[PDB]
Design an enzyme around this catalytic site. Structure first.
Site, PDB file in Angstrom:
ATOM      1  N   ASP A 150       0.852  -1.214   0.000  1.00  0.00           N
ATOM      2  CA  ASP A 150       0.000   0.000   0.000  1.00  0.00           C
ATOM      3  C   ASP A 150       0.883   1.259   0.000  1.00  0.00           C
ATOM      4  OD1 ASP A 150      -2.434  -1.317  -0.197  1.00  0.00           O
ATOM      5  OD2 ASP A 150      -3.219  -0.614   1.746  1.00  0.00           O
ATOM      6  N   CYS A 161      -1.394  -0.318 -13.655  1.00  0.00           N
ATOM      7  CA  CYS A 161      -1.541  -0.201 -12.195  1.00  0.00           C
ATOM      8  C   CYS A 161      -2.766   0.697 -11.988  1.00  0.00           C
ATOM      9  CB  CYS A 161      -0.231   0.293 -11.581  1.00  0.00           C
ATOM     10  SG  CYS A 161       0.566   1.707 -12.416  1.00  0.00           S
ATOM     11  N   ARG A 201       4.248   1.806 -10.862  1.00  0.00           N
ATOM     12  CA  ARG A 201       4.566   0.349 -10.905  1.00  0.00           C
ATOM     13  C   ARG A 201       4.687  -0.135 -12.373  1.00  0.00           C
ATOM     14  NH1 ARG A 201      -0.028  -1.393  -6.378  1.00  0.00           N
ATOM     15  NH2 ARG A 201       0.522   0.277  -4.891  1.00  0.00           N
ATOM     16  N   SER A 202       3.793   0.276 -13.254  1.00  0.00           N
ATOM     17  CA  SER A 202       3.822  -0.056 -14.698  1.00  0.00           C
ATOM     18  C   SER A 202       5.177   0.376 -15.299  1.00  0.00           C
ATOM     19  CB  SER A 202       2.666   0.624 -15.405  1.00  0.00           C
ATOM     20  OG  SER A 202       1.409   0.062 -15.050  1.00  0.00           O
ATOM     21  N   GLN A 212       7.256   7.195 -10.490  1.00  0.00           N
ATOM     22  CA  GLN A 212       6.491   8.304  -9.838  1.00  0.00           C
ATOM     23  C   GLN A 212       7.267   8.862  -8.624  1.00  0.00           C
ATOM     24  OE1 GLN A 212       2.468   6.312  -9.398  1.00  0.00           O
ATOM     25  NE2 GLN A 212       1.769   8.401  -9.836  1.00  0.00           N
TER      26      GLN A 212
END
Ligand SMILES: N#Cc1ccc(Oc2ccccn2)cc1
Length: 284
Positions: A181, A215, A221-222, A262
């Site tokens: 998370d 994602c 994450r991608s 990110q």
């Protein structure tokens, strides 16, 4: 400069934030005019994440051809990926239309439907063999065939049917279920195994259309998934594996979709994955 030495130098100096901002500063900026049309406002999950016009995927329909998805084409590595957002309630039919039209074999999902107590994407695949999904807006049918649930990921066999022609295809769903998370995994071990599981499937290979990766926003994450895959493949076909510049590869990929990676923690995790993944590639 061997990336493993560059790594220890950034870590000992604690300059991850400064490296990351240099990338943000040098990254490409291209128009996203189709994404910002008022007719497309409910086709976008986030107001600040849009595909560039030059690289966006077009839906094959005259009505509205727009989806929040981008084609990343790497030349020396000879790999293509489509990076897209988690589908919305009103874009689930568009998503499966894109998988059909682009001839993708695999979908890679790097998020849970719910994280931090909020919805991150729609429940876009069937959970039970006998309860299939029909997308009336795009005339497709989707059936769960089988499910293999492991500790760090789940693999699902799906059947996608073009109700217009009655052709069917097998789609593999690779669902990475344990990304935390907050932050990034402590070890890249389980992430790298997963990539090799997509790899092993044939989903990343040139006899199929590009893999669809997502994602929540389709950049974080991608971004990590396709940066690591590309870096490791170049380390394979090049006489000097130490030539591979993870940052310059990441700026080439940011020419096709904005915001890939990110946070400075995602950038560090990308280094760790490539460094670790390279020991069992350079022949171990
Ligand atoms: N496929 C691929 C690919 C290979 C290399 C790239 O960029 C550089 C440039 C100079 C030195 C090292 N890498 C970008 C993309």
């Amino acid at each position: 400069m061997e990336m493993e030495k560059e790594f220890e130098q950034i870590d000992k100096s604690g300059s991850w934030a400064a490296i990351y901002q240099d990338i943000r500063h040098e990254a490409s900026d291209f128009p996203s005019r189709v994404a910002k049309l008022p007719k497309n406002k409910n086709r976008n999950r986030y107001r600040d994440v849009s595909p560039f016009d030059h690289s966006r995927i077009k839906l094959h329909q005259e009505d509205n051809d727009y989806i929040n998805a981008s084609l990343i084409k790497m030349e020396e590595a000879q790999r293509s990926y489509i990076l897209t957002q988690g589908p919305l309630p009103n874009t689930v039919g568009h998503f499966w239309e894109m998988v059909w039209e682009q001839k993708s074999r695999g979908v890679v999902m790097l998020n849970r439907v719910m994280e931090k107590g909020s919805l991150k994407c729609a429940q876009y695949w069937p959970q039970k063999e006998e309860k299939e999904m029909i997308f009336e807006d795009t005339n497709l049918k989707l059936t769960l065939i089988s499910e293999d649930i492991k500790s760090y990921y789940t693999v699902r066999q799906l059947e996608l049917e073009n109700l217009t022609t009655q052709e069917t295809r097998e789609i593999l769903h690779f669902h990475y279920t344990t990304w935390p998370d907050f932050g990034v995994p402590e070890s890249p071990a389980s992430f790298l195994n997963f990539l090799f599981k997509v790899r092993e499937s044939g989903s990343l290979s040139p006899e199929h259309g590009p893999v669809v990766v997502h994602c929540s926003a389709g950049i974080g994450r991608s971004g990590t998934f396709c940066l690591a895959d590309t870096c490791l493949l170049l380390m394979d076909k090049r006489k000097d594996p130490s030539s591979v510049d993870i940052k310059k590869v990441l700026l080439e990929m940011r020419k096709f979709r904005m915001g890939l990676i990110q946070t400075a923690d995602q950038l560090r995790f990308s280094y760790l994955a490539v460094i670790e993944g390279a020991k069992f590639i350079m022949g171990d």
